[PDB]
RNA sequence: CGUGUUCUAAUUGAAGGUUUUAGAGCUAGAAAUAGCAAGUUAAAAUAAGGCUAGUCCGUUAUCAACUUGAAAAAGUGGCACCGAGUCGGUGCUC
DNA sequence: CAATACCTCTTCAATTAGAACACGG
DNA sequence: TTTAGGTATTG
């Protein structure tokens, strides 16, 4: 006789229970435990809060990291295992010192000095070769045998930090001189293209190409010197290509299909080559000439140093940085001595202040130290060159800085190679292992290979040819690499909804194509002059149509049918076709795709070869990497010409279908012995449809399927709640709410509800890049003209201006950067139709009156001027298809009366699909009973509501919601949603299809919805009491019921249950604190004394536990008795559970009482004394446990007082509210008295409270809007949970935390329900 | 069907940061002190660590209590009424 | 004791897959 | 992107 309404949010879940007259019931419960009480009475409405659920994204980037860090450790491992024999010969302990290089001299086992043991020599190496990049030049240059331990020393370093694989190819650093290389291209292109000849013109190609200027520009700067060549003309692309780019010369050679080329991209050498043959072999020389330049320029940025001396440029550059520090370090210090020597300690000796002494020795970034000395360099004179260097960002470089990593790995490998070649003569073992050693630097598992697991990884999927250990060297052979690649993908791709078991067919499969075609053809009607009835296409006719027309054309069209087949074959001079649009919707595209590739039409037609064409496409869809693609294209390799095969690889396919293969031809109807495809071709008489067939009872197809949906019988609840497409947090809530219902029903005597009413409610650097790119494609200097910062664009009217590129969207005029305030944000589509605050639906222009009518999308006039302008933006990606299409819409017709009706509806019916399964799951769990007909006995209605019913209802009925006062409102919001949705479908059963779950003309529809919520009101002239005119049933009573709502709303006691959740996650703050004398510090590794070595700190605690036990005090070690809290940290927790006592004793607690220990999750609740209540938060601290049941009038009063966004109300009413603000303006004192009395009673943090009071007291003069909003601010001290910062108008009130758990220890412990209804109460004295 | 954004799940890379150690500091001066020279680099751990010993796994999800289960998860607590500062009383069942 | 006041690893690359949602045709 | 438990500091 009751109904349950619930609110499901990210962090909260609101529930309620309602009588037959919208009252809320009031039951007396039991209370297990030792306390005197044996029952308590509580209301039937409330909210269960919790911590927001957390996504796996951080954890995965952890998962990734750990797999990542160790592999790098492994590379440093293979060098040693290569080296071990020859290193012991040379040195016994070199490797041992390195492993133990970290340990303290006292704990050091071998000689402290890693490289040579001796103190004297190590000093020597460090001063001939002071930075490891001084050593890296030597052994790529020197032709004199060198100490092996220096050689390994070089090698690991490159391997440990190796360079990025963004670019894959081979680099011959014979490319140092760009001018020479470029000039050589001018030559070979002239020879190729005698008719139009370039002139080199003495461009500082090295100078032009070399420069930092943006990549697109340089090719422009180069073509600005040429005497009159087009940018996109053949030369231009080539030039553009060497600089990393993906130009296109398809337009100069008019290839039918676009021919796009990146040197960097893996698919280049063939790609040009696959292309190159097609333009003649002659050019091929031209591109290589281009690559050779690319190599010389490509590396240009890492070193501008003359190539000619050095075969190891990148490292040589670092030597350069070192020298350019030294003399600028002498000259700075020297200059400071020359002027302002007095302030010289701060700059160098003192770490703290960002001084150079800070820079080397303190936590001072390169950007933190460059902006410290900026005044000083300026303030000083004679430093002018110095200033120039800094502005360049070159002032005092360090060898490791954030940027490196635009160093490709192929010079780090360019330099590994030079060393081995250099010294393999001295040492035979290198030539034996040069390949291995290079392969260590070279080798990266691909993504599709996955973790090299052996059956123990939830994550990995690869499969093994040989079970021997995998080493970079043996890799291809051990891993079933291709097969593994098909495994990568076949776990993230779909299964048929109809058939769970069969994995979905790829999109470009011929069979889907013979299915789509034969299906769209099944309902073609045709008529001619002679016939009585227009009739279906016959089986003979369809096959004839598919074979002739479709197999001959990509697209088959209506008059292709009329004249090509009927006239040609059936000779109907003229015909009428009912079935189709201008052309058939499907096409036999894949059939056509192939015909071009292999040119054997009968082959495609032949049935026997048909499983090849699906295992061609399943392999062509399935794979990304062209080398990978080849492997399974060998299996069918024998038949085709070699020339085709090369062609075959290129046309890769994408996307996947929804239909399987046993469906389309998989299953056979028993009586008729035909599969759907069979059915589709040749259903005699009526031509049944896929949909039809799947519901033809006469047919077995529905029946057979029936088993398929059933198999596995669904899955248990979280197994299902964790597969719904949505927020991780939202799913957590979805679960929690059902755990509420099964109680609320359990509570209501296991009596199922009449109605269950559900609601759900609804980047800093992202803005920077999108603009960054957009201007670049646009090429405007507007970004240059005015620059801005990454922290600035959370303000739209600023941010919008940039996407619009400083021009009026509706006006074609430039914009005032400074006075954005005068201008107006305009939402393209009016808010009344839809509520959109997105960058997608907003625009900024001076006046929002130039778009057009208030009541429509921007006017035809607006589109005409700037439709074109809107294209530059879309291409720039400065706007979007959603943003664009609406903007251009008016030429599509402005929103039709049909459109408007649609928006007004969607405000009220929830079409959000995440809120659907949730609705569905309730129905399924709730209604299990089955009637004699297959039909379902729906005994609980489910209802989904949009927020706007309830949110508006408070606005129009004096039920205002102030979130800030209390956590209560999340619970009122079920109640309202309960009675709203119950009373709705008691007046309009017709809407039950829309509002409840289970199976032009618009203008009126607009009316029907807009006024739907009228009936509650007395005047809009409505009768007080509502009814169903059909059933003679009462639904509403304006007088009695409204009063009831107020009675429910202001109820003093609501159930508010912070979920007790055990803490999880990282053990402690990731930061590694320096060695300290603290027992707080945690030893980073099991041997490493943090007093000695440094450690972590700040461990989080998965749950605390009360030990009532004894410890010894004093020399006597007398055993006293304690009862304290011991938090068990998350490193510790695993250890605890194996045995607590042994673990507990270890801490030193003695004669621990085994039975007494009680696990306490974070957020546990104790009520001590006055009814002041507290939630555990950490072992040492507790949280505000109390809620404020503010009498409503104060709740109502404030909402108006804050006066949010001024007033949105209808004008006459606004007068009505105001007097009451100041009739009851004295209420403000009442509120403070309400906080003031309560704060004294429960919050119990007086030291602050006087402080708070005073702020209000001296601000009595200030207006209510000011004072009024702020009092709302002041609620923050009050609120359930943990202290945070807050202020009155300018006065900031710091928090007061609760610093020990002692006061809990002889107090009540409350273990409540998932609802707060059932409790068990524990008086802690013992 | 086409397209596009957004968000989620997985995999495979790069660059910094941090932490002890190694880069013979000197000149005075009994000393705290005070004069100047030096600084740019490397090694190593990078969740403690687990057994299934992999170039594997190690921060998501799920969690009142009590009886019971390995775990999953099943089982446990009268009703009415009048009233309201976090549930208080009444009558009834019991 | 419990009042104040500081601290909290970061920023980039590449590849697949699928909902969900909103424009067009 | 800011909270809200851990840390040692000062009165």
Curated annotation (Swiss-Prot):
Q: Which UniProt keywords apply?
A: Antiviral defense, DNA-binding, Endonuclease, Exonuclease, Hydrolase, Magnesium, Manganese, Metal-binding, Nuclease, RNA-binding
Q: Which InterPro entries does the UniProt entry name for this protein?
A: Cas9, Cas9-BH, Cas9_PI, Cas9_REC, Cas9_RuvC, HNH_CAS9, HNH_nuc, RNaseH_sf
Outcome of mutating residue 841 to A: Decreased DNA cleavage. Processes guide RNAs correctly. In vivo, retains Cas9-mediated CRISPR interference in plasmid transformation
Which residues make up the binding site for Mn(2+) 1? 7, 759
Q: Give the region (RuvC-II) as residue ranges.
A: 715-762
Application notes: Coexpression of Cas9 with an artificial single guide RNA (sgRNA) which fuses the crRNA with the tracrRNA in human cells has shown it is possible to target and modify DNA sequences of interest. Cas9 plus the 2 sgRNAs have also been expressed individually in human and mouse cells to achieve DNA targeting; cleavage efficiencies of the artificial sgRNA were lower that those for systems with the 2 sgRNAs expressed separately. Microinjection of Cas9-encoding mRNA and a synthetic sgRNA into zebrafish embryos induces targeted mutations.
Family the UniProt entry places it in: Belongs to the CRISPR-associated protein Cas9 family. Subtype II-A subfamily.
| HAMAP family, alphabetized | Cas9 (MF_01480)
How are the domains described in the entry?
Answer: Has 2 endonuclease domains. The discontinuous RuvC-like domain (approximately residues 1-62, 718-765 and 925-1102) recognizes and cleaves the target DNA noncomplementary to crRNA while the HNH nuclease domain (residues 810-872) cleaves the target DNA complementary to crRNA. Has a bilobed architecture with a recognition lobe (REC, residues 60-718) and a discontinuous nuclease lobe (NUC, residues 1-59 and 719-1368). The crRNA-target DNA lies in a channel between the 2 lobes. Binding of sgRNA induces large conformational changes further enhanced by target DNA binding. REC recognizes and binds differing regions of an artificial sgRNA in a sequence-independent manner. Deletions of parts of this lobe abolish nuclease activity.
Name of the featured protein: CRISPR-associated endonuclease Cas9/Csn1
């Amino acid at each position: 006789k009751y109904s349950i309404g619930l609110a499901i949010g990210t962090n909260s879940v609101g529930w309620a229970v309602i009588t037959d007259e919208y009252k809320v019931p009031s039951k007396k419960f039991k209370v297990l435990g030792n306390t005197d009480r044996h029952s308590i009475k509580k209301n039937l409405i409330g909210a269960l809060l919790f911590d927001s659920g957390e996504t796996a994204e951080a954890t995965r980037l952890k998962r990734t990291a750990r797999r990542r860090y160790t592999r790098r450790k492994n590379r440093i491992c293979y060098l040693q295992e290569i080296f071990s024999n020859e290193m012991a010969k040379v040195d016994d302990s070199f490797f041992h010192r390195l492993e133990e290089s970290f340990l303290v001299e006292e704990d050091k086992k071998h000689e402290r000095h890693p490289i040579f043991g001796n103190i004297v020599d190590e000093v020597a190496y460090h001063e001939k070769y002071p930075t490891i990049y001084h050593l890296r030049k030597k052994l790529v240059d020197s032709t004199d045998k060198a100490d092996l331990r220096l050689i390994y020393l070089a090698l690991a370093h490159m391997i440990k930090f190796r360079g990025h694989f963004l670019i894959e190819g081979d680099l011959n650093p014979d490319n140092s001189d760009v001018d020479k290389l470029f000039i050589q291209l001018v030559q070979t292109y002239n020879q190729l293209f005698e008719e139009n000849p370039i002139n080199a013109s003495g461009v500082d190609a090295k100078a032009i190409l070399s420069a930092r200027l943006s990549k697109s520009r340089r090719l422009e700067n180069l073509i600005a010197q040429l005497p009159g060549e087009k940018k996109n003309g053949l030369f231009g692309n080539l030039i553009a290509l060497s600089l990393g780019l993906t130009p296109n010369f398809k337009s100069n050679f008019d290839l039918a299909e676009d021919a796009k080329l990146q040197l960097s991209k893996d698919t280049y050498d063939d790609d040009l080559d696959n292309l190159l043959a097609q333009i003649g072999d002659q050019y091929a020389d031209l591109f290589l000439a281009a690559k050779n330049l690319s190599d010389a320029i490509l590396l240009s940025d890492i070193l501008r140093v003359n190539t000619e001396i050095t075969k190891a440029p990148l490292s040589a550059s670092m030597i350069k940085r070192y020298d350019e520090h030294h003399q600028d370090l002498t000259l700075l210090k020297a200059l400071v001595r020359q002027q302002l020597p007095e302030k010289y300690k701060e700059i160098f000796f003192d770490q703290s202040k960002n001084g150079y002494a800070g820079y080397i020795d303190g936590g001072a970034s390169q950007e933190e130290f460059y902006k410290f000395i900026k005044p000083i360099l300026e303030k000083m004179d004679g430093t002018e060159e110095l200033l120039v260097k800094l502005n360049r960002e070159d002032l005092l470089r360090k060898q490791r800085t954030f940027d490196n990593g635009s160093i490709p790995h192929q010079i780090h490998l360019g330099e590994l190679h030079a060393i081995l070649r250099r010294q393999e003569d001295f040492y035979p073992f290198l030539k034996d292992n040069r390949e291995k050693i290079e392969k260590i630097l070279t080798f990266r598992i691909p993504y599709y290979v996955g973790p090299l697991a052996r059956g123990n990884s939830r994550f990995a999927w690869m499969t093994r040819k040989s079970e021997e250990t995998i080493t970079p060297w043996n890799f291809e052979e051990v891993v079933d690499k291709g097969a593994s690649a098909q495994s990568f993908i076949e776990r993230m791709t779909n299964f048929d909804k109809n058939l769970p078991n069969e994995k979905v067919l790829p999109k470009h499969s011929l069979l889907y194509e013979y299915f789509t075609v034969y299906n769209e053809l099944t309902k073609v009607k045709y008529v001619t002059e002679g016939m009585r009835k227009p009739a279906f296409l016959s089986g003979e006719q369809k096959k004839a149509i598919v074979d002739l027309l479709f197999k001959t054309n990509r697209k088959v069209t209506v008059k292709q049918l009329k004249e090509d087949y009927f006239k040609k074959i059936e000779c109907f001079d003229s015909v009428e076709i009912s079935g189709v649009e201008d052309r058939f919707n499907a096409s036999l595209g894949t059939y056509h795709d192939l015909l071009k590739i292999i040119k054997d039409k009968d082959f495609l037609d032949n049935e026997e070869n048909e499983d090849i064409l699906e295992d061609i496409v399943l392999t062509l869809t399935l794979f990304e990497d062209r080398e990978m693609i080849e492997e399974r294209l060998k299996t069918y390799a024998h038949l085709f010409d070699d020339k085709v095969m090369k062609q075959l690889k290129r046309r890769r396919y994408t996307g996947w279908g929804r239909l399987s293969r046993k469906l389309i031809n998989g299953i056979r109807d028993k009586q008729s012995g035909k599969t759907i495809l069979d059915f589709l071709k040749s259903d005699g008489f009526a031509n049944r449809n896929f949909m039809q067939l799947i519901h033809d009872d006469s047919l077995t197809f529905k029946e057979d399927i029936q088993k398929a949906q059933v198999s596995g019988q669904g899955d248990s609840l979280h197994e299902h709640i964790a597969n719904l497409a949505g927020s991780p947090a939202i799913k957590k809530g979805i679960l929690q709410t059902v755990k509420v219902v099964d109680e609320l029903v359990k509570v209501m005597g296991r009596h199922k509800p009449e109605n269950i009413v559900i609601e759900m409610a609804r980047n800093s650097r992202e803005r920077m890049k999108r603009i960054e790119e957009g201007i670049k494609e646009l090429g405007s200097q507007i970004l240059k003209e005015h620059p801005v910062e990454n922290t600035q664009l959370q303000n739209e009217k600023l941010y919008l201006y940039y996407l619009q590129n400083g021009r009026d969207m509706y006006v074609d005029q430039e914009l005032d950067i400074n006075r954005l305030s005068d201008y107006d944000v305009d939402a393209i589509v009016p808010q009344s139709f839809l509520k959109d605050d997105s960058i997608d639906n907003k625009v900024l222009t001076r006046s929002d009156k130039n778009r057009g009518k208030s009541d429509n999308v921007p006017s035809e006039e607006v589109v005409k001027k700037m439709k074109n302008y809107w294209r530059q933006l879309l291409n720039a990606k400065l706007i979007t298809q959603r943003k664009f299409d609406n903007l251009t819409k008016a030429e599509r017709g402005g929103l039709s009366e049909l459109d408007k009706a649609g928006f007004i509806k969607r405000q009220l019916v929830e079409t959000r699909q995440i809120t659907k399964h949730v609705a569905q799951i309730l129905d399924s769990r709730m209604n299990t009973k089955y009637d004699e007909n297959d039909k379902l006995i729906r005994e609980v209605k489910v209802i989904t509501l949009k927020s706007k019913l309830v949110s508006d209802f408070r606005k129009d009925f004096q039920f205002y919601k102030v979130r800030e006062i209390n956590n209560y409102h999340h619970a009122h919001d079920a109640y309202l949603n309960a009675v709203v949705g119950t009373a709705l479908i008691k007046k309009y059963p017709k809407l039950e299809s829309e509002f409840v779950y289970g199976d032009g003309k618009a203008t009126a529809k607009y009316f029907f919805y807009s006024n739907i919520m009228n009936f509650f009101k007395t005047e809009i002239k409505r009768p007080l009491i509502e009814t169903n005119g059909e059933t003679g049933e009462i639904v509403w009573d304006k007088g009695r019921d409204f009063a009831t709502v107020r009675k429910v709303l202001s109820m003093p006691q609501v159930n508010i249950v912070k979920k007790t959740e055990v803490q999880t996650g990282g053990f402690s703050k990731e930061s590694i604190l320096p060695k300290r004398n603290s027992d707080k510090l945690i030893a980073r590794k099991k041997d490493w004394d943090p007093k000695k070595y440094g450690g972590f700190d700040s461990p989080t605690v998965a749950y605390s536990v009360l030990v009532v036990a004894k410890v010894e005090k004093g020399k006597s070690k007398k055993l006293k008795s304690v009862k304290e809290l011991l938090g068990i940290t998350i490193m510790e927790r695993s250890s605890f559970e194996k045995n607590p006592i042994d673990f507990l004793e270890a801490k030193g607690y003695k004669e621990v009482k085994k039975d007494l220990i009680i696990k306490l999750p974070k957020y546990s609740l104790f009520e001590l004394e006055n009814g002041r209540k507290r939630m555990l938060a950490s072992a040492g601290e507790l949280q505000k446990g109390n809620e404020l049941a503010l009498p409503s009038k104060y709740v109502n009063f404030l909402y108006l007082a804050s006066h949010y966004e001024k007033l949105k109300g209808s004008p006459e009413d606004n007068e009505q509210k105001q007097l009451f603000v100041e009739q009851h303006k004295h209420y403000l004192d009442e509120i403070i008295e309400q906080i003031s009395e309560f704060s004294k009673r429960v919050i119990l943090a007086d030291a602050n409270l006087d402080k708070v009071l005073s702020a209000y007291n001296k601000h009595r003069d200030k207006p209510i809007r000011e004072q009024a909003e702020n009092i709302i601010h002041l609620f923050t001290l009050t609120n359930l949970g943990a202290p945070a910062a807050f202020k009155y108008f300018d006065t900031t009130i710091d928090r007061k935390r609760y610093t020990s758990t002692k006061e809990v220890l002889d107090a009540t412990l409350i273990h409540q329900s998932i609802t707060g209804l059932y409790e068990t109460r524990i008086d802690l004295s013992q």
